[PDB]
Amino acid sequence: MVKKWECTVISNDNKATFIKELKLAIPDGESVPFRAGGYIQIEAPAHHVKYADFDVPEKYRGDWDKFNLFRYESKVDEPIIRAYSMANYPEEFGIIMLNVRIATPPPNNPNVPPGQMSSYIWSLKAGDKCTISGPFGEFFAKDTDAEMVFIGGGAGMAPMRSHIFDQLKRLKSKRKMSYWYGARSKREMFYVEDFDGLAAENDNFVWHCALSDPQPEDNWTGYTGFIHNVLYENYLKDHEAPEDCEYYMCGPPMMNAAVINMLKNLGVEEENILLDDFG
Ligand SMILES: Cc1cc2nc3c(=O)[nH]c(=O)nc-3n(C[C@H](O)[C@H](O)[C@H](O)COP(=O)(O)OP(=O)(O)OC[C@H]3O[C@@H](n4cnc5c(N)ncnc54)[C@H](O)[C@@H]3O)c2cc1C
Ligand SMILES: NC(=O)C1=CN([C@@H]2O[C@H](COP(=O)(O)OP(=O)(O)OC[C@H]3O[C@@H](n4cnc5c(N)ncnc54)[C@H](O)[C@@H]3O)[C@@H](O)[C@H]2O)C=CC1
Numbered sequence: 001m002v003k004k005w006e007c008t009v010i011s012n013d014n015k016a017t018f019i020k021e022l023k024l025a026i027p028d029g030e031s032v033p034f035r036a037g038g039y040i041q042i043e044a045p046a047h048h049v050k051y052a053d054f055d056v057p058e059k060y061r062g063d064w065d066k067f068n069l070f071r072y073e074s075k076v077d078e079p080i081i082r083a084y085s086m087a088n089y090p091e092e093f094g095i096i097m098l099n100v101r102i103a104t105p106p107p108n109n110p111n112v113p114p115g116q117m118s119s120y121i122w123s124l125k126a127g128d129k130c131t132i133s134g135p136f137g138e139f140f141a142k143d144t145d146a147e148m149v150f151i152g153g154g155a156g157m158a159p160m161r162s163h164i165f166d167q168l169k170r171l172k173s174k175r176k177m178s179y180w181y182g183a184r185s186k187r188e189m190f191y192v193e194d195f196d197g198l199a200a201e202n203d204n205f206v207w208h209c210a211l212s213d214p215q216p217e218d219n220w221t222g223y224t225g226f227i228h229n230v231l232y233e234n235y236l237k238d239h240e241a242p243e244d245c246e247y248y249m250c251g252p253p254m255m256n257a258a259v260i261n262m263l264k265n266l267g268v269e270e271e272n273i274l275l276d277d278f279g
């Protein structure tokens with residue numbers, strides 16, 4: 001049942017301004033027996049970390065400097081635990097990959113404490129230990145032949161990647177599949193080579209990214225605006241049977257609400273709407 005692993009951090013690089021990909025090596029090269037969409041728990045001891053010690057690459061530091069985010073510190077005097085979704089799929093053996101947003105204090109409340117566990121995770125470097133437990137889960141794919149529409153935003157990426165690779169690689173699915181991902185700007189995109197490669201290799205999979213706040217330096221000529229509107233205008237509006245698809249979503253609360261509203265207005269039933277709310 002519930003097992004615990006004292007893992008070793010392989011890498012903990014930024015994938016976006018405010019997202020790190022934590023890669024963990026499982027002891028003895030064993031694999032966590034998880035399902036795509038599932039999660040583990042990370043636990044951490046009492047500790048004290050400083051944002052100034054974070055490894056944030058130059059290309060991502062712009063908004064860190066703009067909003068003086070390196071000011072922050074997190075002192076935690078009790079053990080803590082949190083859930084994080086796997087970004088790897090089950091046959092990426094011997095590892096656990098996470099996509100962790102740094103939960104800074106809100107702008108209108110800049111002096112409340114920073115997020116406890118995400119600050120701790122962003123402190124980790126290669127060779128550090130990280131204890132996880134699980135696996136757990138409920139955000140699982142349905143076992144049908146229905147067309148799948150995956151809708152991700154921001155820091156909701158991880159279960160989308162896990163799901164999509166699980167279908168196309170482990171299950172060798174022939175189901176029609178698409179992924180619609182909303183990012184603020186081009187530097188906030190990630191897993192581009194992974195999804196481009198899957199799309200190129202699988203005639204039943206395509207993906208699209210929309211930028212809601214494209215930046216002058218992005219030279220962006222792709223889709224813009226909120227991902228739900230892009231998905232509607234460029235695919236679902238013309239679809240002959242949107243109610244016949246299964247929708248799997250993980251994104252900001254406002255994205256989830258806009259998506260659900262749009263789908264219900266197309267006649268999609270709740271049975272066909274699955275989402276993972278991180279709380
Ligand atoms: C099943 C599941 C899967 C998940 N998967 C992911 C995932 O893939 N990636 C991911 O990034 N997260 C994921 N989460 C969320 C994750 O578990 C944490 O909730 C998240 O990392 C924030 O926790 P934290 O300890 O860093 O912040 P907390 O310490 O819980 O704080 C949250 C926020 O509250 C703010 N805050 C603190 N005090 C105050 C105050 N007085 N007034 C106002 N605001 C205040 C903090 O600054 C911070 O912004 C998942 C959650 C679940 C349940
Ligand atoms: N940890 C995170 O996920 C953070 C995300 N951001 C996001 O970056 C974008 C910044 O937009 P820009 O066009 O560059 O500038 P801007 O000044 O126009 O940003 C607009 C909003 O950024 C918000 N913001 C969110 N987190 C903030 C933080 N920690 N400190 C200060 N302001 C914060 C403020 O409410 C402001 O209203 C916003 O989308 C903001 O939400 C910014 C800071 C941290």
Ligand SMILES: NC(=O)C1=CN([C@@H]2O[C@H](COP(=O)(O)OP(=O)(O)OC[C@H]3O[C@@H](n4cnc5c(N)ncnc54)[C@H](O)[C@@H]3O)[C@@H](O)[C@H]2O)C=CC1
Pocket residue numbers: 101152153154155156181182183184210211212225226227228250251252253254255258276277278279
């Ligand atoms: N599954 C969950 O519960 C998740 C929750 N979040 C939370 O959502 C907030 C924003 O997270 P970020 O990763 O910085 O996202 P973000 O601010 O970078 O937004 C990501 C994408 O979401 C869509 N979106 C954002 N605001 C929207 C709105 N008002 N209407 C419609 N679509 C919108 C856009 O397509 C945007 O590109 C944070 O508080 C984060 O904790 C984020 C991701 C997943």
Ligand code: NA
Pocket residue numbers: 015016017186187188189190
């Ligand atoms: Na990026």
Ligand code: NA
Pocket residue numbers: 198199200201202203204205206
């Ligand atoms: Na394709």
